[PDB]
Amino acid sequence: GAMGSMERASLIQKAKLAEQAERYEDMAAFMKGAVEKGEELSCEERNLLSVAYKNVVGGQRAAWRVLSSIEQKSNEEGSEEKGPEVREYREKVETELQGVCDTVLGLLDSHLIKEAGDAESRVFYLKMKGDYYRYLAEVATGDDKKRIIDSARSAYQEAMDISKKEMPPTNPIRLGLALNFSVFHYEIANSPEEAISLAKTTFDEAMADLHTLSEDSYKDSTLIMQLLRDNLTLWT
């Protein structure tokens, strides 16, 4: 790897600089280098890894959706034939997106998840595994769509089981996991009723636990609860 000669601490320092400069591709490459040093990641380092790749893949997903929409319109009756270029370029962006997801999944498999023993790290990484399989599922159309969807579901489910046993209902990792699993149910798994039920139960159980929290934790938890409510408003 091109980051093999850089100190772990220097990679983390530069990831933070890249974040300030909104250079998320650089940030992701620095954090990949840090993961590949082989040591476990602290809470802050996990957040840096997540921010970096979320921004990279977010740009790719937005571009893929623009290109896919143009492609679909070109395949409607009455549409003038424009050649293979739209499909080719959508395929190019799709392949790069798949590459980023495979990179993240590879870091989780080698060897972040297997070394993660605490609930906060293990749930975080399993949620990420669900998220990146979900992004693969958004573009999947072939013989492996079902298996990609099941891989996402499985990762989310293991994360949910741990989070329910080991974390309070207001924990932001638990809340963000439930939010994203609910989106999986609505957008990927054709299960809007499961999505609504999960969002509602997650919101209500967090509400009942807010009284235990400090002002700062209260602000963290209620911010994510508002996202659950925003989805429930969209879905109902």
């Binding site: 974040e19 957040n47 932001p172 990792i173 963000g176 989106v183 989805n231």
Partner: peptide
């Protein structure tokens, strides 16, 4: 689009 969240982005 439904709202999702990155835990790192939320904290960072």
């Amino acid at each position: 689009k439904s709202n999702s969240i990155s835990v790192g982005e939320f904290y960072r």
